[PDB]
């Protein structure tokens, strides 16, 4: 009979943000930051991997 | 157009390009490797079905 095996694996410690947060244009990786005062300031990041 | 806009704002009258109005579409490209697919016996079309 069939059996489904779900796997969970720990990765390297990294900066973690939600996927809805990452804007990907295939040349630049940015996220809109909410500065102290409330000033929306975009910032470039470097993606590693993603899941879940 | 880009290079025409350059010679556009150098003659009596205001100007603006267009090459920028016509951008902003986001894509995820599945670029099939014929050699890779061939290995598993699949043809370009076969991979495309998925």
JSON list of C-alpha atoms in Angstrom, two decimals:
[
{"chain": "A", "resi": 1, "resn": "UNK", "atom": "CA", "xyz": [0.00, 0.00, 0.00]},
{"chain": "A", "resi": 2, "resn": "UNK", "atom": "CA", "xyz": [1.03, 3.60, -0.67]},
{"chain": "A", "resi": 3, "resn": "UNK", "atom": "CA", "xyz": [2.77, 5.75, 1.93]},
{"chain": "A", "resi": 4, "resn": "UNK", "atom": "CA", "xyz": [3.57, 9.46, 1.85]},
{"chain": "A", "resi": 5, "resn": "UNK", "atom": "CA", "xyz": [6.81, 10.53, 3.52]},
{"chain": "A", "resi": 6, "resn": "UNK", "atom": "CA", "xyz": [7.10, 14.21, 4.40]},
{"chain": "A", "resi": 7, "resn": "UNK", "atom": "CA", "xyz": [10.65, 15.36, 5.11]},
{"chain": "A", "resi": 8, "resn": "UNK", "atom": "CA", "xyz": [11.83, 18.24, 7.28]},
{"chain": "A", "resi": 9, "resn": "UNK", "atom": "CA", "xyz": [15.45, 19.36, 7.15]},
{"chain": "A", "resi": 10, "resn": "UNK", "atom": "CA", "xyz": [17.32, 22.00, 9.14]},
{"chain": "A", "resi": 11, "resn": "UNK", "atom": "CA", "xyz": [19.36, 24.45, 7.07]},
{"chain": "A", "resi": 12, "resn": "UNK", "atom": "CA", "xyz": [22.14, 26.96, 7.66]},
{"chain": "A", "resi": 13, "resn": "UNK", "atom": "CA", "xyz": [21.19, 29.82, 10.02]},
{"chain": "A", "resi": 14, "resn": "UNK", "atom": "CA", "xyz": [20.08, 32.71, 7.81]},
{"chain": "A", "resi": 15, "resn": "UNK", "atom": "CA", "xyz": [18.03, 35.89, 7.74]},
{"chain": "A", "resi": 16, "resn": "UNK", "atom": "CA", "xyz": [14.38, 34.86, 7.47]},
{"chain": "A", "resi": 17, "resn": "UNK", "atom": "CA", "xyz": [11.50, 36.78, 5.91]},
{"chain": "A", "resi": 18, "resn": "UNK", "atom": "CA", "xyz": [8.06, 35.80, 4.55]},
{"chain": "A", "resi": 19, "resn": "UNK", "atom": "CA", "xyz": [7.82, 35.01, 0.84]},
{"chain": "A", "resi": 20, "resn": "UNK", "atom": "CA", "xyz": [5.21, 37.72, 0.22]},
{"chain": "A", "resi": 21, "resn": "UNK", "atom": "CA", "xyz": [7.90, 40.15, 1.35]},
{"chain": "A", "resi": 22, "resn": "UNK", "atom": "CA", "xyz": [10.47, 39.32, -1.34]},
{"chain": "A", "resi": 23, "resn": "UNK", "atom": "CA", "xyz": [10.11, 41.13, -4.66]},
{"chain": "A", "resi": 24, "resn": "UNK", "atom": "CA", "xyz": [11.96, 39.30, -7.43]},
{"chain": "A", "resi": 25, "resn": "UNK", "atom": "CA", "xyz": [12.56, 40.87, -10.85]},
{"chain": "A", "resi": 26, "resn": "UNK", "atom": "CA", "xyz": [15.17, 38.34, -11.96]},
{"chain": "A", "resi": 27, "resn": "UNK", "atom": "CA", "xyz": [17.95, 40.91, -11.70]},
{"chain": "A", "resi": 28, "resn": "UNK", "atom": "CA", "xyz": [17.37, 42.58, -8.35]},
{"chain": "A", "resi": 29, "resn": "UNK", "atom": "CA", "xyz": [16.01, 41.24, -5.06]},
{"chain": "A", "resi": 30, "resn": "UNK", "atom": "CA", "xyz": [14.29, 43.91, -2.98]},
{"chain": "A", "resi": 31, "resn": "UNK", "atom": "CA", "xyz": [12.03, 44.29, 0.05]},
{"chain": "A", "resi": 32, "resn": "UNK", "atom": "CA", "xyz": [10.15, 47.37, 1.25]},
{"chain": "A", "resi": 33, "resn": "UNK", "atom": "CA", "xyz": [11.37, 48.34, 4.73]},
{"chain": "A", "resi": 34, "resn": "UNK", "atom": "CA", "xyz": [9.30, 50.26, 7.28]},
{"chain": "A", "resi": 35, "resn": "UNK", "atom": "CA", "xyz": [11.78, 52.74, 8.77]},
{"chain": "A", "resi": 36, "resn": "UNK", "atom": "CA", "xyz": [11.53, 54.03, 12.35]},
{"chain": "A", "resi": 37, "resn": "UNK", "atom": "CA", "xyz": [9.50, 57.12, 11.44]},
{"chain": "A", "resi": 38, "resn": "UNK", "atom": "CA", "xyz": [7.25, 55.08, 9.16]},
{"chain": "A", "resi": 39, "resn": "UNK", "atom": "CA", "xyz": [9.21, 55.86, 6.01]},
{"chain": "A", "resi": 40, "resn": "UNK", "atom": "CA", "xyz": [8.90, 53.06, 3.46]},
{"chain": "A", "resi": 41, "resn": "UNK", "atom": "CA", "xyz": [12.44, 52.52, 2.18]},
{"chain": "A", "resi": 42, "resn": "UNK", "atom": "CA", "xyz": [13.25, 49.72, -0.31]},
{"chain": "A", "resi": 43, "resn": "UNK", "atom": "CA", "xyz": [16.42, 47.68, 0.25]},
{"chain": "A", "resi": 44, "resn": "UNK", "atom": "CA", "xyz": [18.32, 45.17, -1.90]},
{"chain": "A", "resi": 45, "resn": "UNK", "atom": "CA", "xyz": [18.85, 41.68, -0.48]},
{"chain": "A", "resi": 46, "resn": "UNK", "atom": "CA", "xyz": [20.49, 38.46, -1.64]},
{"chain": "A", "resi": 47, "resn": "UNK", "atom": "CA", "xyz": [18.26, 35.38, -1.70]},
{"chain": "A", "resi": 48, "resn": "UNK", "atom": "CA", "xyz": [19.56, 32.01, -0.53]},
{"chain": "A", "resi": 49, "resn": "UNK", "atom": "CA", "xyz": [16.76, 29.46, -0.65]},
{"chain": "A", "resi": 50, "resn": "UNK", "atom": "CA", "xyz": [13.03, 29.38, 0.13]},
{"chain": "A", "resi": 51, "resn": "UNK", "atom": "CA", "xyz": [10.25, 26.97, 1.11]},
{"chain": "A", "resi": 52, "resn": "UNK", "atom": "CA", "xyz": [7.10, 26.75, 3.24]},
{"chain": "B", "resi": 1, "resn": "UNK", "atom": "CA", "xyz": [13.17, 55.74, -29.71]},
{"chain": "B", "resi": 2, "resn": "UNK", "atom": "CA", "xyz": [15.60, 56.00, -26.80]},
{"chain": "B", "resi": 3, "resn": "UNK", "atom": "CA", "xyz": [18.17, 57.67, -29.06]},
{"chain": "B", "resi": 4, "resn": "UNK", "atom": "CA", "xyz": [15.46, 59.74, -30.75]},
{"chain": "B", "resi": 5, "resn": "UNK", "atom": "CA", "xyz": [14.31, 61.11, -27.39]},
{"chain": "B", "resi": 6, "resn": "UNK", "atom": "CA", "xyz": [17.89, 62.31, -26.99]},
{"chain": "B", "resi": 7, "resn": "UNK", "atom": "CA", "xyz": [17.56, 64.38, -30.17]},
{"chain": "B", "resi": 8, "resn": "UNK", "atom": "CA", "xyz": [14.00, 65.27, -29.17]},
{"chain": "B", "resi": 9, "resn": "UNK", "atom": "CA", "xyz": [14.74, 67.40, -26.11]},
{"chain": "B", "resi": 10, "resn": "UNK", "atom": "CA", "xyz": [17.19, 69.36, -28.26]},
{"chain": "B", "resi": 11, "resn": "UNK", "atom": "CA", "xyz": [14.65, 71.04, -30.54]},
{"chain": "B", "resi": 12, "resn": "UNK", "atom": "CA", "xyz": [11.80, 73.53, -29.83]},
{"chain": "B", "resi": 13, "resn": "UNK", "atom": "CA", "xyz": [9.24, 71.43, -27.96]},
{"chain": "B", "resi": 14, "resn": "UNK", "atom": "CA", "xyz": [8.99, 69.05, -25.00]},
{"chain": "B", "resi": 15, "resn": "UNK", "atom": "CA", "xyz": [9.33, 65.28, -25.45]},
{"chain": "B", "resi": 16, "resn": "UNK", "atom": "CA", "xyz": [9.09, 61.85, -23.82]},
{"chain": "B", "resi": 17, "resn": "UNK", "atom": "CA", "xyz": [10.00, 58.25, -24.66]},
{"chain": "B", "resi": 18, "resn": "UNK", "atom": "CA", "xyz": [7.84, 55.11, -24.70]},
{"chain": "B", "resi": 19, "resn": "UNK", "atom": "CA", "xyz": [10.21, 52.18, -24.26]},
{"chain": "B", "resi": 20, "resn": "UNK", "atom": "CA", "xyz": [9.51, 52.52, -20.53]},
{"chain": "B", "resi": 21, "resn": "UNK", "atom": "CA", "xyz": [5.71, 52.66, -20.66]},
{"chain": "B", "resi": 22, "resn": "UNK", "atom": "CA", "xyz": [5.85, 49.23, -22.27]},
{"chain": "B", "resi": 23, "resn": "UNK", "atom": "CA", "xyz": [7.55, 47.26, -19.50]},
{"chain": "B", "resi": 24, "resn": "UNK", "atom": "CA", "xyz": [6.90, 45.69, -16.13]},
{"chain": "B", "resi": 25, "resn": "UNK", "atom": "CA", "xyz": [5.68, 42.22, -16.98]},
{"chain": "B", "resi": 26, "resn": "UNK", "atom": "CA", "xyz": [6.97, 39.57, -14.60]},
{"chain": "B", "resi": 27, "resn": "UNK", "atom": "CA", "xyz": [7.98, 36.12, -15.81]},
{"chain": "B", "resi": 28, "resn": "UNK", "atom": "CA", "xyz": [9.05, 32.69, -14.64]},
{"chain": "B", "resi": 29, "resn": "UNK", "atom": "CA", "xyz": [10.90, 31.04, -17.51]},
{"chain": "B", "resi": 30, "resn": "UNK", "atom": "CA", "xyz": [10.99, 27.27, -17.94]},
{"chain": "B", "resi": 31, "resn": "UNK", "atom": "CA", "xyz": [13.89, 27.01, -20.39]},
{"chain": "B", "resi": 32, "resn": "UNK", "atom": "CA", "xyz": [13.94, 23.39, -21.53]},
{"chain": "B", "resi": 33, "resn": "UNK", "atom": "CA", "xyz": [17.33, 21.73, -21.98]},
{"chain": "B", "resi": 34, "resn": "UNK", "atom": "CA", "xyz": [17.01, 19.48, -25.03]},
{"chain": "B", "resi": 35, "resn": "UNK", "atom": "CA", "xyz": [20.10, 17.48, -24.09]},
{"chain": "B", "resi": 36, "resn": "UNK", "atom": "CA", "xyz": [18.94, 17.01, -20.50]},
{"chain": "B", "resi": 37, "resn": "UNK", "atom": "CA", "xyz": [15.42, 15.99, -21.51]},
{"chain": "B", "resi": 38, "resn": "UNK", "atom": "CA", "xyz": [16.72, 13.65, -24.22]},
{"chain": "B", "resi": 39, "resn": "UNK", "atom": "CA", "xyz": [18.51, 11.67, -21.53]},
{"chain": "B", "resi": 40, "resn": "UNK", "atom": "CA", "xyz": [15.23, 10.71, -19.87]},
{"chain": "B", "resi": 41, "resn": "UNK", "atom": "CA", "xyz": [13.74, 10.15, -23.32]},
{"chain": "B", "resi": 42, "resn": "UNK", "atom": "CA", "xyz": [11.49, 13.21, -23.22]},
{"chain": "B", "resi": 43, "resn": "UNK", "atom": "CA", "xyz": [11.16, 15.62, -26.13]},
{"chain": "B", "resi": 44, "resn": "UNK", "atom": "CA", "xyz": [10.82, 19.40, -25.77]},
{"chain": "B", "resi": 45, "resn": "UNK", "atom": "CA", "xyz": [7.05, 18.98, -26.11]},
{"chain": "B", "resi": 46, "resn": "UNK", "atom": "CA", "xyz": [6.91, 16.27, -23.44]},
{"chain": "B", "resi": 47, "resn": "UNK", "atom": "CA", "xyz": [8.51, 18.50, -20.82]},
{"chain": "B", "resi": 48, "resn": "UNK", "atom": "CA", "xyz": [6.18, 21.35, -21.82]},
{"chain": "B", "resi": 49, "resn": "UNK", "atom": "CA", "xyz": [3.09, 19.32, -20.93]},
{"chain": "B", "resi": 50, "resn": "UNK", "atom": "CA", "xyz": [3.94, 19.52, -17.24]}
]
